[PDB]
Amino acid sequence: MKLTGEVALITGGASGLGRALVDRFVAEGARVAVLDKSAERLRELEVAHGGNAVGVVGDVRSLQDQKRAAERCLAAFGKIDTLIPNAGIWDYSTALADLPEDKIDAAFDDIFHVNVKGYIHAVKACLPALVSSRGSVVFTISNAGFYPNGGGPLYTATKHAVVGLVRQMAFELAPHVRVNGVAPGGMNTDLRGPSSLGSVPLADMLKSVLPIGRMPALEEYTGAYVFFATRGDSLPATGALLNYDGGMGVRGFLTAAGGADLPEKLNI
Amino acid sequence: MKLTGEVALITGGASGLGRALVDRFVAEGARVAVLDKSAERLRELEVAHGGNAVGVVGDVRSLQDQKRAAERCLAAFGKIDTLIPNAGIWDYSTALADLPEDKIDAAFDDIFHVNVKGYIHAVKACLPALVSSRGSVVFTISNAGFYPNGGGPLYTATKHAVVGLVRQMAFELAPHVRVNGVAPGGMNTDLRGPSSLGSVPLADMLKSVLPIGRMPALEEYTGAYVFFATRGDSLPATGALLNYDGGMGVRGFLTAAGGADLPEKLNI
Amino acid sequence: MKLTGEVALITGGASGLGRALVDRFVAEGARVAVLDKSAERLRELEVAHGGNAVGVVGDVRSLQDQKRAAERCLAAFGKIDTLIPNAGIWDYSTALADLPEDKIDAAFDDIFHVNVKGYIHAVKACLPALVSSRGSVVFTISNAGFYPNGGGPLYTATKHAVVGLVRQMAFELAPHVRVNGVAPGGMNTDLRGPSSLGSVPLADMLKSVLPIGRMPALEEYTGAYVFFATRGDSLPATGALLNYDGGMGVRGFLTAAGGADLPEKLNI
Amino acid sequence: MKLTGEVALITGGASGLGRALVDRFVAEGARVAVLDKSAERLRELEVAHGGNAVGVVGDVRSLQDQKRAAERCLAAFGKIDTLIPNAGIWDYSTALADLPEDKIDAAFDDIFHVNVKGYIHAVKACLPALVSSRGSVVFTISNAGFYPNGGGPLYTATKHAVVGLVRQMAFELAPHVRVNGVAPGGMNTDLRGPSSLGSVPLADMLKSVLPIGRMPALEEYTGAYVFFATRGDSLPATGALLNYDGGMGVRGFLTAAGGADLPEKLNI
After folding, report:
1. Where do the TM regions start and end (chains A, B, C, D)?
2. A262 interfacial to chain D (CB closer than 8 Å)
3. Domain limits at D116?
4. Nearest 5°: CA angle at B239, between B238 and B242?
5. Residue C84, H or E segment
6. Domain count of chain D?
7. Of the residues A20, B38, C230, D153, which has the fewest C-beta atoms closer than 10 A?
8. CB C145 within 8 A of CB C183
9. Partner residue facing B148 (CB), from C97, C250, C266
10. CATH number for the domain harbouring residue C238
């Protein structure tokens, strides 16, 4: 119960990592406003957390819907301590050469409007509340904000753009609001794409991609966020970027891990 | 003359850094095609260089215009060895708080369509020619692709996004096309902002910004691009990022430069 | 209490951040072994925590001393879940020009033997126990592992070297041992330098250094280490680097923080 | 002939990349002082470049020998414009678990004294000349200064430490001396180790390690250095870090390159 008394707003919190975050935050004693597109999934969530969650239907690309979510959060819980802009869409790892010429303009808008603009609108809408509470923003990034081959040019560009948001917003909102990034990766989750458009099997994932040698469940990706939301724990942190992807950036050339056989080599 | 027989295509090449790059490449023995919105400044550079530079009036946001620049370059010179997507737009360093709610959506599009989508379209247009010549792309980034306070959230996010393009496109176009980034910074360029949107002079704050202790002329920033365009010099480089901003990322806390008193301390 | 039943070993844990970490881990339910040069400050912490902390007097530069700490921890508690190599030495922010020629060799050894080699020996000593418990290492880095002006060349080079250890050891010890780094910064610790070697107060320059706009108490920096020590929270993290320095890397050019006037501009 | 009139000092310039640099610099019109251990190899080099090279026998770990080299350079050519600290030793990729306990202390000193201290001594010795000429330092780094699996903990830590030297020295020597890093990798070269101590075949190197799909010759690694030594080209660059390793940091998860089959896919 690290978050007793705290209030969070989470975008894209009806399913996936968003939902795992909502469930984790509630279990920690926090109260959670959720912005997402599915009314039915939001109401199911509300009743699962009776009193600790409020669900607001809306589009993350719309500043007005972002504002509605912030107002609704304010009305139910009285404050906003932590904002987690989290809602994102994928590009299917569609390479530049495979992006249809008649499709690139639409695809760009679809992915950038959700992934980057929706993050910008979330901060904008929650800004007065966050300054008031001296709160924090924790952006969901991705491995694709750091290394290639986690998406195509569009997705990879969006997640690199949110690293820019972490940096610029950590500067701009200082000294009142802290701004940090968690960059999750290698999760067991189905990533959706845009209407305009439309990748590694388990064997290659754990031998070549993930040094930790396993694909963690969604709940295991929630602790980094809880850390940034815990005022007693994360106060010195602003503009921080936590890579949270099983070790993708420290993977080896021939194998992901170098010490599979340490238990036998050290004869522990 | 390091680039004799080479062909470059530069977007945003009729003024600012782009123009200095046109001048430099022509002087290095290269033939140059230029995509720019300014017919006047394009005519001007066409008379300066003669048959060594062709200008195409167009909009960097448009794929058909980028393709038209690529075809016009092919028709004039036979090939494309180097692409320099360079054309950019600023956001008047406008903070999120100061971004008007009624303008923020259109402002997002204006700056992201030129700074990011225009880069993507440039590469898309030129891909067949670049793969044919086994050439290279060199993206103009900025200090705002790496550190805060070089623009507002919109611009900083866009330039962080082109860092994403350097990395993803270096992966995607390898082994045939090398993709690198130059990140220029201490320039006295007066870069325009969007019409959907209504900062201290660099000289006034130099000692808090630039370790090099001086404001380089525009021509001083062209050498990095020549390096990346020269096959015999930059062959091992792909996915490289050259911070080329006077040392903004290595500035001290009290003052930018740490060795002002070195000539006295060493008795020069 | 997040660390009930866990055992940590902390080098340099009798004063400064190290001591705050001992206090925090004991309060989280963990049992703690401490390697420190100060028998006095070790006795002091032994009476404060009772059977929850054992102190071993020794030299972090010495492998046999590090091994002795590991064996003493094993004998007292049965296992090692977390290693925090933390013990460090400063260089009085002495510039290269100001490093005496007759002292520079010994100064190199003093600072590199504790800051780098002492980290290597800590991990070497504890490897069998860490692999057995499938635990983790958390290296104390510093803002000087990432940006200039946080020490002279010697210290900055050492802290950049521990960044190398985070990455290489995360690769080498995966999948069994996670290796991460915390990089603390805005502390009021008075860290000692070498005897082979004879800076503005942080408070005087705060507005040029810290976006957060305040000097955190030592206890405020302990939460990141608890996060990394907690298996249920930091499981996907290996090779991660947490900048935890008040936002030194995202400071503005004129002043550290960009939003001093946010409460007035939003009318809080 | 980019370097006509310029004077360079290069450590470890008798063989390997050092020698390729010496040969390149002389071909560009520069004059070169070389510090290395082999008298016979230095004299052979001197006569190959009659008048454009001076060879000084000495140990890079010794400030006195570094001073001798600087004095000798001053005496033959009258100035020093560019310093390239380049001399380095490898660790054989010896993992922490494979470093013998009776060998680690010696091995640490051997690799750190050459790789880090020898770089520090080179700058120290050449400092008055470089301030006088307003010159530049270009440190040879490595992929091992950025990613794991290019060496063991020792080598990787040393090359990460030189990134720290780039940053701190770029700050400290500003505004008079520029300081940058080239980080070469994937070269066809035999890397020597220390007396205390004592890795990828071609097939795995070009499929998994090098996006560029080829191992470049040594001469192809010389252009980045020529760039930093060319005053007309690199003036805005201080604290820059050029990754120069075939694209190791932008390599893909399953294959190094993503676009091997672009010529056929685009049907160029």
Report:
1. none
2. yes
3. 1-268
4. 100
5. strand C82-84
6. 1
7. B38
8. yes
9. C250
10. 3.40.50.720
